Design a protein around this ligand. Structure first.
Ligand SMILES: [Mg+2]
Ligand SMILES: [Mg+2]
Ligand SMILES: [Zn+2]
Ligand SMILES: [Zn+2]
Ligand SMILES: [Zn+2]
Ligand SMILES: [Zn+2]
Ligand SMILES: [Zn+2]
Lengths: 186, 927, 75, 590, 185
RNA sequence: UAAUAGCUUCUUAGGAGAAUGACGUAGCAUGCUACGC
RNA sequence: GCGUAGCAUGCUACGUCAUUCUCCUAAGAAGCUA
């Protein structure tokens, strides 16, 4: 706008017009100078609108570039998080039993629903009432999934540890069922 | 004398008989023939009058379940049936006949005597279960009692027939499983005997008593021996819904198929039961002449996926439930051993293997990282084994080391609005407008006790011959839309600040994944799902919303890996449905600017004697059978006749099943297996539900038309239509487009319908529905009973005989006819309790301020405007209460703003929100 | 207007109990939720008042959580 | 974000930018504050700078409000509106503010640097809100004074136990003791992150430190240390709760013949039960910390929280409770860092117990039936406000004596503070007198109480004991060695060593010295249990050694010497330097 | 509007009005009309920016008020909720609610949920003999607008105390507060 | 922790179009006046 | 009769601004329904 020579042309035309008006020149010269100033300011406004459009387009392009940069930086963060999760879950795997069962497969393909059932080293049992507790995992060891599990901890709905001696028919109302008994394979 | 007749009927067999008739005359009974001849067709309850029935009594003179049917007919039929029986005499599955000629009065009237039949036939059981009316169920009760399924006092329970209130009825029915299975075996023996004896004939249910013996040879023609053919299309197909209801094949889990011997211990590693399925099919459905592919990946089209999947539904109940689900395989990436899912074993679609399995890789692209972190193979393989005794559903693994018990908070009370309301005369004792909608709180056992409701989803084998025609009628209903695959750049997502499912919600909303993945690797993922199966976990989120009943509501958040591809696959069709006006499926039709009136006028499309009807689906999203969900997915996929190949469409269907129908469900930090039923969070949920609703309605019409007598149908066009409908169902294997169009036009003329995914208003013809030529409420009750395993109590189903009052309730909006301008229009008005409860109870503390939320009350008053024209003043006062409260909120907001500054707002256009005209403009058809 | 006044005070009372971290005590929170739901789904005023008494006894049982003197001396 | 004016509690959005705490101020009060002092920068929701493309003007009365921004005199738009005008300063809630005359002391509280004693005496005689703000900004000043210290670095590690020290050139070297901790840095290329929390303390030989750290990382030459700045948390509770008198006992229930030992304090127990809060004044060794435990035994059903600003005081209280109170119902809450070796004999960190012991700064937000604040003399208004904020209780009781040594107040370097202005409760003890008082020495030998009854107190304290002749007054010059900004007197330590083997019964004597440097460095030379006088407050010992390191105004303080000598129980040796202090007491000849 | 552009527009409008009041003809009239129009255009350009500025200011005021009120309401959420609860509880004026609240002010709080089923256990703590005299008469216990039968009274020492051991004179030797276990009648 | 979809209200920003008013430039039609032929 | 010039009236094209309306997109808040 101001940097362009159109503004300089407008300024010099206005200065000439003011000097002529203060000098009281002839009316025809006044009209000629008014026409010159009009075309000068016409070119000025013609050039200015392009500047406004150009600066708005540059601003929206800068906003778009910032948005894309932020999205690209978020993609890398989510990729790193997913990789760390996948490799941590991999490292948590029980390699010996998993390899045994997968090799025993005829085609190398096994259903997912038997991977925990035959290779998990920890069992969590959620028990809603006392009769269920008596029937499924009474005592300190019990049988499930064709294995032998031993109790290592019993916690209630509050995740507050419960001793095995507190789980009685008369003390049942004083417990926060369900109890999440965590067992380990023997 | 009538005594010589009894002595002759006794015959050489030492049988002691007591005549059920009266004086050597035919006994009249009301049986349930499956008949098709030149003048009548259908599976209806007729009145046979050609058989003299004598009942045999055992020792101590107790009447037992054995009858001597002494059918008499012409002489030529006598000779013909005697010859056909002589051919089939030695087959063990044939009731011992007795052909003699007894002088009834003065002439030799020839009788054939069937010896030791049961009272009812197989057709009576099939009809009593497929046409269940709890007000008149006397053959079902007698069949259940006479075969020791119950003790004749079991029916003194209030609702002994209800599946969702009395789940012991499943055991009571399953006590008939062994008898039904023995009937199937006897049918196969009889088919083999017909084949070897050179006899051509049709096998109908009403000719096999409940023991299994066959006794009707009237219409059997004999051809060259060794080349007879049994026509069993209508025998097996009608019997199909009874095979899973009674669990006829529960004796196949036992070694040597003996109900006393212990279960078969299949090796856990075994997942490919194709040979077992083939052996079962060749043992029970031997002469079912259409080819059966155990693995539906080999199928020919979606008409062959339905049939083979329907069989796989029945055959999957005898295989261990731990052999299904994803099939994992140990792949290596840069030498590190992954365990990933490279297949699936559907209960309906058989074994499906992925085609792009990379055993040795080095880098994981973002697409592959998403796929491997989406499927539950890693999460279940690295999680602790779980045994959740709170639910009967299968539990896979516990991801964390302790279970999460998620609660639901109570609502936040807007005391200012309540004080304002009671200052306006509201909430008095004895008033008609009272609070019924609240924010109900839930304990830690809410999410799991709500997930446990999937136990109402039972394996249902559908009537495949009838279903394969209902599908044609439904696809005719969906013939005005267009669909197909679109590029990732054409997919528009409404709200991207929404949860991404599990496990992706640990790192961002759906916006992060829709931004990170360029269009190229969204198209790559979509084209991956067309050649591979991606299992996916779906969370269960407790819904924090206001309702009138204290049951916990849960919604399933499907993973972004499933949502993106399902959007890209179905969005064109879904946006085509939402932009169509005046169709059957009114989705995307607003109720403002005259939308409700337009919808109601299009429902009354030139019906003759209209009565409005509406029904309810109890446990709709949980009791929906897997077969009907697969049918809905196939119907929505018929628009892909050019974009997708055959294998592409099958793998899209397999992904839909493995991600929505039966996938791993994350409920409180633990992976459970969803038995079936639609999840309420998949991409095409409302539209699939609309397809299922139309399917149920069309099935109800089909059953209503076929179950009518046929001798009572006066209109020669309707009787012919019933005849050709039976022909198109059970006598024609290819599609007949002419009759499909004719039946579609018939339904549109007499059963005009309006569907929004489970809310339906029907404007049927009252005269036809009374005469039985169109579905009524009772037909929907029967269809739901045998095809959803739920009982539809007639308390939630309404009927409106007067159209000046509109539908009683559609989309929770009652309809009233008001004078607007110079004419009469229908306006939808809500339940006032709902609007007042929305005003008083809010789900956030910042919505209790009031002055911050004036748009809330503007929207609520927009919804509550049509109450102004209600005749009940306590209803009309809700709108004025909201207007006056908006005025008070604006006044105190201006006061607070004037305090917080020293200048009032220069521009204030809030003065139009407490004038009735701004809201009256919302129901005027100009826009 | 007495029946509808109880149904709202039960909502406020359960909000207070939830803010006091009664939600962590599963056995007590189950009873509080049951009482709140039965007050909301009530047709008789006497039954609702008895259940409100039981539900408020939960708040009064914890002495140090609420300043009953300060709260009630502001009326 | 809006707030409340500090001295008027009117809604406002104006905060003084120049003030350390940036307190919310109403329009009138902000106008009076900026029109009077040198504070001229005010922070609204947006700061009051001039929003010209280039301009830096902060004086509010120089700026004008034009359009959507605040501009200076020479940049305002043609339509202007003054900010500071009409006796107010523009901000939210302009026409709802009522000012006050408290804008006079607030100016002094804000502007002053707390160096002179007048700031403290004007910060403790104002109203509740001004008392709170003055304490808040004083703690802010103390915390910000640490920003002027220096960054340390390591030269080499000849031995992994004796680390080498090196400070940044041109910055002061903070003293090396337990009070200061240092967290390392690895700013090289290459992990400009912390490497753990370490500490320093001078070694005897050369420049080496037997250091200590939470982790076991080894430092390269590139690693160096940075002192951790500590933020100042807000405080809103009153320094004192309003005292209300009850007609009879409320919230407390007595016992049946509590004990034959505490039966003399029953009337004061009733007095504590009667009032909302009470104050107990008692000279050292008169049973104040023995009164609180007797009250605890007098109210078994009452949940009681024992508190103290320091750690050694609550440790001694826990020891006395272990002696008297049942140990099953006990607790002791420790900060996670646990820099100081605390008292670990009960179930540590069990807030839900009946009798709870915890320092003030680590108090948990919980209730109680009576809280006894011990040794209020060491406590500041920040501490009283914190104890009234975190600990809501049915009864309060403050015990202590004005004559004991006050809180450190490190930046205070000019003049002396009178006892009555240490904190509000002490002023209450001095204005109308304490609610309870019991003057009778019960721990010290007769000689030392007879000598101390004339130094600070004017012949008031009687005792019940006999002068065991174990009181020795040692006279020596004590050459001065100023090593670590705290004076060390090596020859006095040597004379102590040479006069320890001739005292077979003095082998367990504790060494008491006002300067932490000598106290810490004496550990290797004598091996005796060591404890400075400031941390020795409230803890009694049967054998105590005191040495006056240097002749200063800090080491020869009358109250400090009194509180140091009143810890002895059967005998005490004092190495004294000042002739005046030496002559005033009557001990053995030596 | 008190704007210099408005002043120029006003003086041009006044000059044109005076001229047209004279209004002979015609070129001077047209020239003054053009001057009025060109001044009006400039004043209207100024006014448009003023209106835009006012709209932005109103948006700022509205957003700031919403944020301030929201943060204030999310801050004062516990005290406000408890005050609302006790205000509503006072408004009900049920006899049982008032009884239990007045008792809890005096310290006579229950130890567990007050049970509804007949012959169910209720345990309350009685802090002083004055509370015992008001509520307990004989073997009946008047609490929560119901009558309760006392089963066993214990002290803070978990020692059973007989009902005859409670009196105005014997109580000072007793270990208050008591704990009364009762069954609903 | 908080799903898919539909519709509606409100606020803001941008773009396009339309209509009117004003200003300016260029071009065209008509009328009046001066000079030359 | 013509040309050069100036002024006045009218028409068209283009540019600028102001106002109003409509629509299309984007973002944010909210409500209802299945
Ligand atoms: Mg027959
Ligand atoms: Mg003490
Ligand atoms: Zn097939
Ligand atoms: Zn496609
Ligand atoms: Zn200041
Ligand atoms: Zn003020
Ligand atoms: Zn400036």
């Amino acid at each position: 706008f101001s940097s362009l020579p159109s503004y300089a042309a407008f300024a010099t035309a206005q200065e000439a017009y003011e000097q002529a008006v203060a000098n009281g020149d002839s009316e025809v010269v006044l009209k000629k100078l008014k026409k010159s100033l009009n075309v000068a300011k016409s070119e000025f406004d013609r050039d200015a609108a392009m500047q406004r459009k150009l600066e708005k387009m540059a601003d929206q392009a800068m906003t778009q570039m910032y948005k894309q940069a932020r999205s690209e930086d978020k993609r890398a963060k989510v990729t790193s998080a997913m990789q760390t999760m996948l490799f941590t879950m991999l490292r948590k795997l029980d390699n010996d039993a998993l390899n045994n069962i997968i090799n025993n497969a005829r085609d190398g393909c096994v259903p997912l629903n038997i991977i925990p059932l035959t290779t998990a080293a920890k069992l969590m049992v959620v028990i809603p009432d006392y009769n269920t507790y008596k029937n499924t995992c009474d005592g300190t060891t019990f049988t499930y999934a064709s294995a032998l599990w031993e109790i290592q901890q019993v916690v209630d709905a509050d995740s507050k540890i419960v001793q095995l001696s507190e789980i009685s028919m008369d003390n049942s109302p004083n417990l926060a069922w369900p109890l999440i008994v965590t067992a380990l394979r023997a | 004398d009538a005594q010589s007749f009894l002595n002759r009927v006794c015959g050489v067999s030492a049988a002691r008989l007591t005549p059920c008739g009266t004086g050597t005359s035919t006994d009249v009974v009301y049986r349930a023939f499956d008949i098709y001849n030149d003048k009548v067709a259908g599976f209806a309850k007729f009145l046979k009058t050609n058989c003299c029935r004598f009942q045999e009594k055992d020792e101590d003179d107790n009447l037992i379940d054995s009858y001597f049917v002494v059918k008499r007919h012409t002489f030529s039929n006598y000779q013909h049936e005697e010859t056909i029986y002589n051919l089939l005499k030695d087959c063990p599955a044939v009731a011992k006949h007795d052909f003699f000629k007894f002088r009834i009065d003065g002439d030799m009237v020839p009788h054939i005597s069937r010896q030791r039949l049961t009272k009812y036939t197989m057709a009576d059981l099939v009809y009593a279960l497929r046409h269940f009316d709890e007000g008149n169920c006397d053959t079902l009760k007698e069949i259940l009692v006479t075969y020791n399924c119950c003790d004749d006092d079991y029916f003194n329970k209030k609702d002994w027939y209800d599946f969702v209130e009395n789940p012991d009825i499943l055991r009571v029915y399953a006590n008939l499983g062994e008898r039904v299975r023995q009937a199937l075996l006897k049918t196969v023996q009889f088919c083999d005997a017909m084949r070897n004896a050179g006899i051509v004939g049709v096998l109908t249910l009403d000719n096999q008593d409940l023991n299994g013996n066959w006794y009707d040879f009237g219409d059997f023609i004999q051809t060259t021996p060794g080349s007879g053919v049994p026509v069993v299309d209508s025998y097996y197909s009608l019997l199909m819904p009874i095979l899973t209801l009674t669990r006829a094949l529960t004796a196949e889990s036992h070694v040597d198929t003996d109900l006393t011997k212990p279960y078969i211990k299949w090796d856990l590693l075994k997942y490919d039961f194709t040979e077992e399925r083939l052996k079962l099919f060749d043992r029970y459905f031997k002469y079912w002449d259409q080819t059966y592919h155990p693995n539906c990946v080999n199928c020919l089209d979606d008409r062959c996926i339905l049939h083979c999947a329907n069989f796989n539904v029945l055959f999957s109940t005898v295989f261990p439930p731990t052999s299904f689900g994803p099939l994992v395989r140990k792949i290596f990436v840069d030498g590190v051993p992954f365990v990933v899912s490279t297949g699936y074993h559907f209960r309906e679609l058989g074994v499906v293997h992925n085609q792009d399995v990379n055993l040795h890789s080095s880098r994981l692209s973002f697409k592959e990282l998403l796929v491997y972190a989406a499927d539950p193979a890693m999460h279940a393989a690295s999680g602790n084994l779980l045994l959740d005794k709170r639910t009967t559903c299968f539990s896979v693994a516990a991801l964390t080391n302790n279970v999460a018990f998620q609660t639901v908070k109570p609502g936040n009370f807007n005391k200012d609005f309540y004080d304002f309301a009671v200052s306006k005369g509201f909430f008095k004792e004895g008033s008609s407008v009272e609070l019924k909608h609240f924010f109900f709180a839930q304990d830690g056992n809410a999410a799991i006790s709500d997930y446990d409701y999937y136990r109402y989803n039972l394996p249902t084998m559908c009537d495949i011959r009838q279903l394969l025609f209902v599908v044609e009628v439904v696809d005719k209903y969906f013939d005005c839309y267009d669909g197909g695959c679109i590029n990732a750049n054409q997919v528009i997502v409404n709200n991207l600040d929404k949860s991404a499912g599990f496990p992706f919600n640990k790192w961002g909303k759906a916006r992060l994944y829709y931004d990170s993945m360029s269009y190229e690797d969204q198209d790559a993922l979509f084209a991956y799902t067309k050649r591979n199966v991606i299992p996916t976990i779906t969370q269960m989120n407790l819904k924090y919303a206001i309702s009138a009943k204290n049951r916990a509501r849960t919604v399933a958040g499907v993973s972004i890996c499933s949502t993106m591809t399902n959007r890209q696959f179905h969005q064109k069709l879904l946006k085509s449905i939402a932009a169509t006006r005046g169709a059957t499926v009114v989705i995307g039709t607003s109720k403002f600017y005259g939308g409700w009136h337009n919808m109601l006028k299009t429902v009354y499309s030139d019906v003759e004697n209209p009565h409005l009807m509406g029904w309810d689906y109890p446990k709709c999203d949980r009791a929906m059978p897997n077969m009907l969900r697969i049918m809905a997915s196939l119907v929505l996929a018929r628009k892909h006749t050019t974009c997708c190949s055959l294998s592409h469409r099958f793998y899209r269907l397999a992904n839909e099943c493995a991600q929505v129908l039966s996938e791993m469900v994350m409920c409180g930090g633990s992976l459970y297996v969803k038995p079936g039923g639609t999840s309420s969070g998949d991409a095409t949920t409302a539209y699939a539900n609309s397809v299922f609703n139309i399917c149920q309605a069309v099935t109800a019409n089909v059953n209503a038309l076929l179950s009518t007598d046929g001798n009572k149908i006066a209109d020669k066009y309707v009787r012919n239509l019933q005849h050709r409908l039976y022909e198109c169902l059970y006598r024609n294997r290819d599609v007949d487009t002419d009759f499909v169009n004719e039946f579609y036009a018939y339904l549109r003329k007499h059963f005009s319908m309006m569907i929004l995914s489970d809310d339906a208003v029907v404007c049927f013809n009252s005269t036809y529905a009374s005469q039985g030529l169109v579905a009524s409420i009772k037909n929907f009750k029967s269809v739901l009973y045998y095809q959803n395993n739920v009982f539809m109590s007639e308390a939630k189903c309404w009927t409106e005989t007067d159209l000046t009052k509109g539908p009683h309730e559609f989309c929770s909006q009652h309809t009233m006819l008001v004078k607007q301008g110079d004419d009469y229009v229908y306006l939808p008005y809500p339940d006032p309790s709902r609007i007042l409860g929305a005003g008083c109870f809010v789900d956030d503390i910042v919505k209790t301020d009031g002055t911050l939320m004036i748009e809330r009350f503007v929207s609520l008053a927009i919804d509550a405007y049509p109450l102004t024209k209600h005749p009940n003043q306590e209803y009309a006062d809700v709108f004025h209460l909201y207007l006056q409260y908006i005025r008070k909120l604006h006044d105190e907001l201006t006061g607070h703003m004037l305090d917080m500054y020293s200048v009032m707002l220069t521009n204030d256009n809030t003065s139009r929100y407490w004038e009735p005209e701004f809201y009256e403009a919302m129901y005027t058809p100009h826009t | 207007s007495k029946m509808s006044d109880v149904k709202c005070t039960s909502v406020v009372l359960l909000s207070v109990l939830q803010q006091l971290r009664v939600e962590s005590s599963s056995k007590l929170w189950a009873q509080c939720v049951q009482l709140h739901n039965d007050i909301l789904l009530a047709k008789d005023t006497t039954e609702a008042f008895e259940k409100m008494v039981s539900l408020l006894s939960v708040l009064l049982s914890m002495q140090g959580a609420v300043d009953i003197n300060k709260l009630c001396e502001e009326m | 974000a809006v707030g409340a004016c500090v001295l008027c509690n009117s809604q406002t959005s104006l905060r003084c930018g120049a003030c350390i705490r940036r307190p919310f101020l109403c329009c009138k009060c902000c106008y009076d504050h900026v029109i009077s002092t040198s504070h001229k920068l005010v922070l609204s929701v947006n700061p009051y700078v001039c929003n010209a493309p280039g301009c830096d003007v902060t004086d509010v009365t120089q700026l004008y409000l034009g359009g959507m921004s605040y501009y200076c005199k020479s940049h305002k738009p043609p339509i202007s509106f003054p900010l500071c005008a009409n006796g107010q300063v523009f901000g939210l809630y302009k026409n709802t503010c009522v000012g006050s005359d408290n804008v006079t002391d607030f100016n002094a509280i804000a502007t002053c640097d707390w160096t002179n004693a007048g700031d403290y005496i004007l910060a403790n005689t104002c109203t509740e809100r001004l008392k709170l703000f003055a304490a808040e900004t004083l703690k802010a000043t103390e915390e910000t004074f640490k920003l002027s210290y220096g960054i340390a670095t390591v030269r080499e590690v000849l031995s992994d136990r004796e680390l080498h020290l090196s400070w940044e050139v041109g910055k002061p070297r903070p003293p090396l003791n337990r009070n200061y901790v240092f967290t390392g840095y690895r700013v090289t290329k290459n992990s400009k992150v912390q490497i753990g929390e370490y500490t320093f303390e001078k070694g005897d030989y050369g420049d080496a430190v037997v250091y200590r750290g939470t982790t076991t990382y080894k430092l390269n030459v590139g690693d160096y240390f940075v002192l951790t700045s500590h933020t100042v948390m807000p405080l809103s509770a009153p320094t004192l709760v309003p005292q209300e008198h009850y007609v009879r006992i409320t919230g407390l229930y007595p016992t049946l013949n509590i004990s034959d030992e505490f039966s003399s304090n029953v009337a004061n127990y009733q007095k504590v039960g009667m009032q909302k809060y009470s104050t107990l004044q008692g000279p050292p060794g008169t049973g104040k910390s023995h009164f609180a435990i007797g009250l605890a035994l007098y109210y078994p059903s009452a949940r009681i929280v024992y508190t103290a600003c320091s750690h050694a005081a609550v440790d001694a209280l826990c020891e006395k409770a272990l002696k008297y109170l049942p140990i099953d119902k006990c607790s002791r809450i420790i900060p996670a860092r646990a820099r100081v070796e605390c008292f670990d004999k009960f179930k540590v960190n069990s807030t839900l117990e009946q009798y709870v012991f915890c320092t003030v700064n680590a108090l948990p937000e919980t209730t109680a039936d009576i809280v006894v604040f011990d040794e209020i003399s060491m406590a500041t208004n920040y501490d009283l406000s914190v104890v009234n904020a975190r600990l809501r209780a049915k009864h309060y009781v403050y015990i202590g004596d004005p004559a004991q040594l006050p809180a450190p107040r490190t930046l205070l370097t000019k003049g002396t503070l009178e006892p009555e202005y240490f904190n509000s409760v002490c002023r209450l003890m001095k204005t109308i007198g304490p609610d309870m008082f019991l003057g009778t020495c019960r721990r010290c030998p007769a000689e030392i109480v007879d000598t101390v009854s004339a130094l600070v107190y004017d012949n008031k304290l009687k005792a019940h004991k006999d002068k065991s002749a174990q009181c020795f007054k040692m006279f020596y010059k004590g050459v001065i060695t100023h090593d670590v900004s705290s004076a060390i007197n090596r020859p006095q330590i040597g004379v102590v060593r040479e006069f320890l083997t001739r005292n077979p019964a003095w082998r367990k004597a504790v060494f008491i010295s006002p300067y932490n440097s000598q106290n810490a460095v004496a550990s290797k030379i004598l091996g005796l249990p060591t404890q400075t006088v400031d941390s020795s407050q409230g803890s009694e010992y049967d054998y105590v050694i005191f040495t006056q390191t240097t002749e200063t105004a800090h080491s020869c303080n009358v109250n400090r010497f009194n509180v140091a000598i009143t810890r002895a129980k059967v005998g005490i040796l004092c190495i004294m330097s000042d002739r005046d202090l030496y002559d005033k007491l009557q001990f053995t000849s030596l």
